[PDB]
Amino acid sequence: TTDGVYRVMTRGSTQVGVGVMQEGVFHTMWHVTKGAALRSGEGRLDPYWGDVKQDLVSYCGPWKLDAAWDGLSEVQLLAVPPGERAKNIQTLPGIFKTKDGDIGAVALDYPAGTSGSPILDKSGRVIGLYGNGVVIGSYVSAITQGKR
């Protein structure tokens, strides 16, 4: 329940992804859990909202993250790769240009178990999650943010 970034594990054990706990809601990407219930301690986190097109899912309540990239500043990926300590990677995002507007995108390539790691602005607010993107051989992840 505590605020923070979390690893998403499955059972040996394997880290399949990452998520963000904020205001009592766990946020991660749909392709990490497919909406399956999550265990935390002796408790169970049930899914509340999910959307395959946005590739997002929230547990225990509605999506709470609403900060956005300002389009000009450097951001930081708080990557939590499997078997490694949480680390911040600063970068200047590129841009996914779509017919429905522009989306920030980071040209950083980390192991698949890092999907769901938060991207932060300078104030420390989560502006999106890492792990849905395109290949240009170099992988580029959209900064995926939900709607609160």
């Binding site: 505590t2 605020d3 923070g4 970034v5 979390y6 690893r7 998403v8 594990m9 499955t10 059972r11 399949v16 990452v18 998520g19 706990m21 904020q22 766990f26 749909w30 392709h31 859990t33 399956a36 219930a37 999550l38 265990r39 935390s40 986190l45 395959v52 097109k53 930081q76 708080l78 939590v80 300590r85 949480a86 680390k87 911040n88 990677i89 600063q90 970068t91 200047l92 995002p93 590129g94 841009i95 996914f96 240009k97 779509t98 017919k99 429905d100 995108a105 980071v106 040209a107 950083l108 938060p118 932060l120 104030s123 420390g124 849905n132 993107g133 395109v134 240009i136 580029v140 959209a142």
Partner: protein, 40 residues
């Protein structure tokens, strides 16, 4: 299948973070299955 979570740290901006990566500008399309694809 036992899916569970473990806390890995605080959500915090770090001043001594490693800095890398470029900033490509790309035309993409997003389909109904959440997959982005390149567009020409």
């Amino acid at each position: 299948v036992d899916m569970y979570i473990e806390r890995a740290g605080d959500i915090t901006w770090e001043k001594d973070a490693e800095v890398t990566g470029n900033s490509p500008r790309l035309d993409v399309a997003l389909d109904e299955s959440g997959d982005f694809s390149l567009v020409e």
